[model samples]
Target chain A: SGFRKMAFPSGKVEGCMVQVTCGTTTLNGLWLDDVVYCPRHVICTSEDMLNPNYEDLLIRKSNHNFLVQAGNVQLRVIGHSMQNCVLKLKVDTANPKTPKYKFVRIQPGQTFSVLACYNGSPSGVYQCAMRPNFTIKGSFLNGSCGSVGFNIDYDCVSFCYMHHMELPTGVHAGTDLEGNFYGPFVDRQTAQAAGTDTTITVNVLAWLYAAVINGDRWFLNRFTTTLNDFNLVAMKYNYEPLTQDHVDILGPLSAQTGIAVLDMCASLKELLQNGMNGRTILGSALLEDEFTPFDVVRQCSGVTFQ
Target chain B: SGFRKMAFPSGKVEGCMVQVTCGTTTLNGLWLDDVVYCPRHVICTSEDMLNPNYEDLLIRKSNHNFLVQAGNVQLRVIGHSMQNCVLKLKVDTANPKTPKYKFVRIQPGQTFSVLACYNGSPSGVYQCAMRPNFTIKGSFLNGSCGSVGFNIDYDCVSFCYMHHMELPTGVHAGTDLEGNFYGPFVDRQTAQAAGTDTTITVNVLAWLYAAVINGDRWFLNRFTTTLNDFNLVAMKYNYEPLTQDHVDILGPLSAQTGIAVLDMCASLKELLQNGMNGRTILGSALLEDEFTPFDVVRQCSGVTFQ
Candidate 1:
């Protein structure tokens, strides 16, 4: 796939970081490894086996602490940026005995919010039990977001640990810019309570490790609260593109030019780099034209162009 | 409607704010003019009919300044968090502004990057319009995300703004981490230069705003650069919960305690203190019952009975 050759007019802007945004690509479970970049970082051994990025991992842990030097800051995970919505984790350096945790806020009566917490460990272990309820701790602009508990096989796995958080206020559940009730979420003023005791108990770390290793276990759960509360008029109209050559303008920059596009490109480049390597090359077939043998090396070494 | 009341048991922890976690209801968009109090202060309003969030009005005609009390931060918008993904804004954000912007990297054996400059009203719009760009300025970390740009009347309106900094290199990009190669995007790479003699002029706002008002105004040649990379796993899996009940357990800590539920219930009580204030009362439809409404109110209010 690497027979194309292109050059940069300004060879100067060469080494700068770039973004390469990617779209969602669906592949069968068996062929996921073939098409997608699981572990996304492609540097691992053959016997090490390729890990499933989808079911197994989404957020990759970084080896280096997030660094912000002078004017340079490489963002590893999306953080509290007004433009980007990312979920980040922070180990409570102040208190290590407690579990490592992450805190994020979602829209209040707005659009969306993020939930980060612990889900019970893998299933089928009987010793670890979750508290009858969960106690999520975080800071809210006005008040507290509050904590809640859920049933997680509390009777079994006394040694297991599971945690999860919810934005009961729907996707928008944090604060309002105008501070009005003009949000998607309505507080809990509805009918009867859904579950028993009308009270929920919580279980702590009853099934941590077991849950971690179990294929059936998951430590996090993010859900959405939605409402179709409005009636809207659908306007359909086609306007002509006033700009000439609007159609002729086809190629890269035609769509992503600024930041968003760059990020996309940069990420994809990273994926390609991570996935193909020397050893990885040895396992694959080689091409005749360039003689680099493996396609990964050719691409990585600019040999993809030769 | 007010007859069906909802409440939460109280004795909530300190610093707790009342919250409404679930159920579907629509509040009048016009109610924004009225002041609603959350914890510390009365929500502000705007006299301007055109714009909401009166605070935004303070333009720095020379450097406008305004300060919002922190903690009141909220996330707004509508639908489940995935609605962004569902509606396709997140995916669309990185679409190639122009097809020319669709290359892998500027050149063979190079990284990805881009540079955007804004020079209209502000004296300073000059920066590196380089290759391998970044996230929309200001839209970093966890802020408002995925903007839709409108290619308005040739007079460009952009969703992307300028932020001063070096471009980004994908975590997976580069010779280290996972050494990989970046190919020329499209069939050509020379066209990828930024701020060079050939400027890839792109207007994002024009593209975004048009999409907001009318449905299909996006996807035009909006971004000079395009984004085609993203974490595939982030999409392949359905991280969102299936329903509202899960949110009940995972709700905020302020409301996380059985007590947080009281806030919403109490607000209802405050409204119905004089007894179901009839149909004219807004939010009346939310409270369908009145039995033990006070007790329900107490739980969310953090008032606990040992």
Candidate 2:
């Protein structure tokens, strides 16, 4: 069997790539350090997903050997008619607390999300959660309470999803001011469908929104603590989020100007140095080999600059 | 009558936005200070394009009052014309030259392109051209030489176009090491087309490529001369161009991650400051209100950081 996507109590999600092929789609764009989420796909455990024989398809294809974050992770199977269950949500983050939820009979059709946000270093609730940065200790899912088969339908990847976006309208890495990991979904369903595809996809637009969100975040974080951060913020310079309303804008989001930010940043940073050097030389009153101010302008344009 | 797009003697391009509604399509993404281009659009003046009824439409709605680049500009209408005809390339960049192109009898349909790259400060060939930096002294186009119609289809905006991409890949503004206006492009024609349009549109791919190029460039330029510029270049990290071959990638380029560079850069620049302040306080050893480097890490995750 292959590895399946897992979810957290907070409703964020994640999973491996190949595991996405059968009926579920994963976004490569969502990947950040091999961590991605999916919210478009369903998360029901009561009905049979596809056919009974197809159970092995997902298990046979997944390559998710390591836990996403370093510490405690939870993977619980839910259903309507659960009388007894034998599945285990293993968490090897040091200092394991006395086991609760260990024997709770999860219902069919529902995914268990009782675990606290073990994202922090580990609190009174998650007394033994691993450090926040990076860890890969134990399997979140083990044993087989779901094999009873009577629970016809169940989603393996529900762990990496949210019915609705919890964070505000921007890309987010699950943490507070400090950089820590609370899982986010591989994808989220959107409000509308694309003309290219007629399906009512969830988070597709959210995904698009997230794309720009990340793009914006990426740029913002670069200057997170820079004086420019305050400058840009004051200027209200923000990227236009791609919503279904401005569907036509989507074409341009990937348009030349959209990606220009990448090269532009690369170029700007290099170019900024010129300005900086100019500023520094001017400030420090340092001498350069060729201090011919406006030399190129005079030689080339024959026009004097102020 | 609608205004027509005009090109410079060199290969760069520009035109009013409406001037692009004709056989040529313009990109809003490429817009910077209201400049754009189209390489896929043909510049032939020999053959009649469509019923010519369409001609008046493009001509009918344009509002190209100001010329691009603000300096002496050229708008020579090229074609195989009669022995004597009228049409002119205007440039009022202060000094006027020997007036060679002034009296030359141009042919019909040739859409004259015999101008040097006046993009520089203006050297010998362009003695009469305006200074390189930014000028609008005279029109790059004036007079009525092409009206003889011998060259059945003289392009109205040949003044604003490039036969081929002159600069290297990645987005570019027409200038050398110095930052000056060279009349880059409203849009550049590329090697392929898209599935959505199903047309053999040239430069569509290039346009897409340029989008990413611009995106990448914007981000890079932010760090233009920063220490990070050297760092990124050494890493050889670059954006993926949206060539026709990898067309599928285009969707995601507009997807979340593509735009992320903007946010990421924004975020990174700001975040780096944290590290910087970290580095600074550590180096200069300034006193912070609370000098807890790994305090957040320890309290949140209950793990020790090095």
Candidate 3:
């Protein structure tokens, strides 16, 4: 809805080599972490200055905007390579009853914006970056410390994944900001049809965007006074009836719906036998399952961590 | 069979930077690959330069000469950064009906040895290098005209997978390498008891690994074969097996048995309806599926070419 502006600096590193950063004067609130001009791979990037064709624009068009609703509009910001950065989303909501501002997880690959429209609200809606320091454990090292890349300064795996405080553990554990899941081709018709298949595929590229919704719901429900009581607001995140364009971005809701259905199936199975859901009924039974900072310890191990 | 020896120059890179060759140097012969002193990740391997670390070696010992077999024979080979290296275990089989030249995969993390009475009938055994050129392609460019480190690489995604391959045809027919599967209970017994009552007591780790292994077995089997039926043999390169004991390496019988199981499973599924047994059935089918060079092309894309 509104135009956004960004500024940054560029200069040579050694003759043909060069380095770039947010402009000293107009960089405003932007912060960068593990930024390097890896000319070997990153071409035409702001970090590259040798070719003279590189222009690193700090700010670009915002792909998302949200209207605020009544009550405290809590925000949970997440993103990759932002361990040293923060996000300020543009939300247009004006009301004291807007949802309360709660805590946020700064895990990797997360950033959110939600619009809330009401019958009676204040003036022009408000806009703000979710939070500063949204990137968890976003750092880099050289040599044996990293894999994938041979010579250049490669982006560490930790750059791509971040840990959350109040979340499930392990790689892709249902709740802990696990990446997307696809398919349950219960039958052949669903598995073979080309158009049907294409339409049902998940939009992993927009995971960060979808995560905005997931993380927001998790934060609101988990941080609520009655920890176990499901919040209507929290559940609303699931039923947000995505806009046609946004839905198009996500090609198929089946990806999300399938996982949700999976959870439901498991819950139903438990109900049929044990009489309760695993996350709720079974979760409370284990007191020893306290959050262990194993991930943080592993990622931050042996680093001259700045 | 007399010990047949062959000689070839150690692969030289940049023509002058380094030159290596193989002669009839008498020791044991353990075929290895990935040998050109790659500048990527190097350590002053004090324990073993030519051979991988002890962990991998131990696994080889376990599955091979631990119980029914005994020879106490070992060999050494070098692998700088090459994957899919092969090592032929030259065994002295007393009987002529069974061959003594055992083809083995030298993976990124393991070691091997010989320790049995060869009976003098099948004594000469040597592992040779088989590094076929592979093709690579991607949406982004990583190298120049026949430049260094230029190979086709892909990442796993939900619709696809960052760590897995992309379905060349359908929209997203493949399941993510990861899915709803869960495991890691001390035993199924421990898991059942702790079920809904004990949260962390269900052995989450086991659940996860099993999920990864079994849930994605369908894709993994194909992906590995696509890498050229070598994924099954290359355990010597990277043996992160469950056991740290030296008595766990795949012996001649064990290796063959696994292959047999895969073959059997494939055939059974072909004649049966896909049902509860389909998981195991399909897994077998993948193994029994015919192997071809095109399969490797699909998995690895292509070998790196200068």
Question: Which candidate ranks first by TM-score, i.e. highest?
Answer: 3
Better of 2 and 3 by lDDT: 2
lDDT of each: 0.18, 0.21, 0.18
Ranked by TM-score from best down, the candidates are: 3, 2, 1
lDDT of 2 by residue, A1-306 (tens): 000011111111111111111123211111122222222121212243222223232344333321223223432212111111111112222222211111122211112221111222111111011112111111111110011100001112222211112222222212211111233222233332211111111112222222342222231123212334322432332222222332443333335225432332332233223332322211121111111111111222222110
Native contacts present in each candidate (fraction): 0.00, 0.01, 0.00
**Two-way lDDT contest, 1 vs 3, winner:** 3
Considering lDDT, where higher is better, how would the candidates rank from best to worst?
A: 2, 3, 1
TM-score of 2: 0.15
- Candidate 1 lDDT, A1-306, residue by residue in tens: 111111111111111112211122211000010111111211212322223332132334342322211112222322211111111222112211122222222211111111111110000000111111111112111111211111111111111111111243311122221111222322232321211111110001111111122221222223211111100100111111112222222122223222222222232223223432222121121110111112112222221000
lDDT of 2 at B131: 18
Write one digit per residue (lDDT tens) for candidate 2, span B20-99: 22223221111112222222112212243222232333343332321223233432222111111111112222222111
In model 3, the Cα lDDT at residue A273 comes to 37
The lowest-lDDT stretch of 10 consecutive residues in candidate 2 chain B is B143-152
Instruction: DockQ each candidate and list the results.
Output: 0.01, 0.01, 0.01
lDDT of 3 by residue, A27-63 (tens): 1111112121111111123333223222232133121
* Per-candidate total of colliding backbone pairs: 204, 168, 88
- Cα lDDT tens digits, model 3, B1-306, are 000011111011011111111221111111212112111101213234334453353333322321111123222231122222212223233222111222223221111111100110111111111111111111111110111110111211001111011123201110111211112111011112111111110111122222232223332233112222322232333212222121122122224324432332232223222322323321221121111222222212211110
